[PDB]
C-alpha cells in the first residue's frame, strides 16, 4: 500500500504539496514550521508532513528525477503543487542576485514536457496559486518580481528569450506546469536568484504561507 | 502625426484597448456603452472611443479569419497600449462539458499560428496577464454570469485537436496566441474572452458586459 519513488502512503499525500530541490533544504523547512512529521527518505527523495498556520501539507525533494516526482504526486492525490528553488536572472540590470521571482509560465526547453504534448502547448501555472503567492509576499512586505521562467535541462537561445522578456531560467518548472495541466493539478513556482549567465528565509515564508492558504480550501 | 493601418492619432490611443474580429461586433458594443465617439474606418479597421463606468478606452476591429490582426496588435503595442483584450468566438474542445453558448476566459493558448512562430521559438508560452484574467473573472462573477476558464488552441484552420483536447485545452480560435506573445514581447498586458460557436444568444451581451466592465476596471489604474 505504498508509492514507488517516494516511499510514502497515498493516505499520507496531502492536497497541497511543496516541492524543492536539495533534500537538505527540506530539513531547513521542517524546522521553520510549527510542527512536522518525517515520512520517508529514498536515495534523493525526502518527504515530510508540515504543519503550519493551522494546515497540513507535504514538503518533498528529488535532487539538484523531477518528472517522476511530479507524476507520482499528481497520480496519487495532489491537488496543488508549488516549486520553490533557485534560478538565474535573465534581466541582469533589473533582476539581481538575491531577488525573488514568482513565475506564472515557462519556456519549454525541457526534454520531458515535449514527450507528453506538442511544444506549442503552453507551460502555464494556476492563477489562484500565483495570486496566493503574491499576497503572502506583499502581506509580509517583501518585494518580489513576477515573470516567465526558461526551464532548460542543462544550462544561447537564452539571449533570445531574455530579449523576449523572460525573467529567469531554471530546470523543471515547465515540466510541472504541463504535467499539472494534463493531470488537472494546480501548479506554481517561486524562485530566488543564484548566478547570471537572509532573503531565502522570506521566500520560504511566502512559499509556506501560500501553501497554508491553499490548504484551507481542501481541509 | 497619425498611424498607418488604424488611421488614428497616437494621442487617441488609450492605455486599455478592446479588440474584436468582425466590425459589426464593434457596432454591437457601441450600443452597450454609456457613450462613444467614432475615430476612423479603413478597409477592415473600425476604431471607436468607448466611455463606460467613468473610463475611456478604445475598441478596434480588424476583420474575420485572422485578417491583419498581427499588424493591429503591433500598431497598438508600438504606440502606447498598456492593456489589450480580445473578445470573440471559438469552438468547444470539451463537447460534454463546454456547450454552444458558453463563455470562456482564457489565460493561455496553444501556438498553432503562423505568426507567433515567426517572432519567437515555439517553446515560448503564449500566456495572458494574470491581473487582466482576474479582472475578467470578477466582472463575470459580479454580474452572476457563469464562465469557464481554460486554454485556447489558436489555429489557422489534422486531428492534433484530439491530442490537445485530451491535454485539457478548452476551446479553439484563431489569434489569441498571437496577441499574447506580441504582448509579452512588447511588454503589453493581454487577455481574452470567448463565446462558443460549435464543436465536431442573449449570452453574447453578457460577455460584452464582462469585457467592457473589465476594461473599465483596468482603465482606472492609468487615468
Curated annotation (Swiss-Prot), chain B:
Catalytic activity: inosine + phosphate = alpha-D-ribose 1-phosphate + hypoxanthine; guanosine + phosphate = alpha-D-ribose 1-phosphate + guanine; 2'-deoxyguanosine + phosphate = 2-deoxy-alpha-D-ribose 1-phosphate + guanine; 2'-deoxyinosine + phosphate = 2-deoxy-alpha-D-ribose 1-phosphate + hypoxanthine
Keywords: Glycosyltransferase, Purine salvage, Transferase
Positions that bind a purine D-ribonucleoside: 5, 174-175
Origin: domain of life: Eukaryota
GO molecular function: guanosine phosphorylase activity; purine-nucleoside phosphorylase activity; uridine phosphorylase activity
Listed Pfam families: PNP_UDP_1
Enzyme Commission number: 2.4.2.1, 2.4.2.44
Pathway field: Purine metabolism; purine nucleoside salvage
Active site: 197 (proton donor)
Binding site for phosphate: 21-25, 43, 86-89
Keyword hit for Transferase: yes
A single cellular component GO annotation: cytosol
Statement: the UniProt record of this protein carries the keyword Glycosyltransferase: yes
Activity regulation summary: Inhibited by Immucillin-H. Inhibited by antimalaria drugs quinine and mefloquine.
Subunit and partners: Homohexamer; trimer of homodimers.
Family named by the database record: Belongs to the PNP/MTAP phosphorylase family.
Function: As part of the purine salvage pathway, catalyzes the phosphorolytic breakdown of the N-glycosidic bond in the beta-(deoxy)ribonucleoside molecules, with the formation of the corresponding free purine bases and pentose-1-phosphate. Preferentially acts on inosine and guanosine, and to a lesser extent on 2'-deoxyinosine and 2'-deoxyguanosine. Also catalyzes the phosphorylation of S-methyl-5'-thioinosine (MTI) to hypoxanthine; MTI is produced by adenosine deaminase (ADA)-mediated breakdown of S-methyl-5'-thioadenosine (MTA), a major by-product of polyamine biosynthesis.
Record-given protein name: Purine nucleoside phosphorylase
Organism listed in the record: Plasmodium falciparum
Amino acid at each position: 500500500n505504498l508509492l514507488r519513488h517516494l516511499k510514502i502512503s497515498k493516505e499520507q499525500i496531502t492536497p497541497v504539496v511543496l516541492v524543492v530541490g536539495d533534500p537538505g533544504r527540506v530539513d531547513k523547512i521542517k524546522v521553520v514550521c510549527d510542527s512536522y512529521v518525517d515520512l520517508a527518505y529514498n536515495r534523493e527523495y525526502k518527504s515530510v508532513e508540515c504543519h503550519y498556520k493551522g494546515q497540513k501539507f507535504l514538503c518533498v525533494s528529488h535532487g539538484v528525477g523531477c518528472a517522476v516526482c511530479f507524476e507520482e504526486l499528481c497520480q496519487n492525490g495532489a491537488k496543488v503543487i508549488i516549486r520553490a528553488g533557485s534560478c538565474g536572472s535573465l534581466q541582469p540590470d533589473l533582476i539581481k542576485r538575491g531577488d525573488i521571482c514568482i513565475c506564472n509560465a515557462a519556456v519549454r526547453e525541457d526534454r520531458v514536457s515535449h514527450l507528453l504534448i506538442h511544444g506549442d502547448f503552453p507551460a502555464v501555472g494556476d492563477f489562484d496559486v500565483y495570486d496566493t503567492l503574491n499576497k503572502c509576499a506583499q502581506e509580509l512586505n517583501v518585494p518580489v518580481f513576477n515573470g516567465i521562467s526558461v526551464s532548460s535541462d542543462m544550462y544561447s537561445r537564452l539571449e533570445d528569450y531574455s530579449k523576449a522578456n523572460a525573467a529567469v531560467v531554471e530546470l523543471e518548472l515547465a515540466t510541472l506546469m504541463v504535467i499539472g495541466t494534463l493531470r488537472k493539478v494546480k501548479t506554481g513556482g517561486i524562485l530566488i536568484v543564484d548566478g547570471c549567465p537572509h532573503q531565502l528565509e522570506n521566500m520560504i515564508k511566502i512559499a509556506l504561507g501560500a501553501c497554508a492558504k491553499l490548504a484551507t480550501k481542501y481541509a
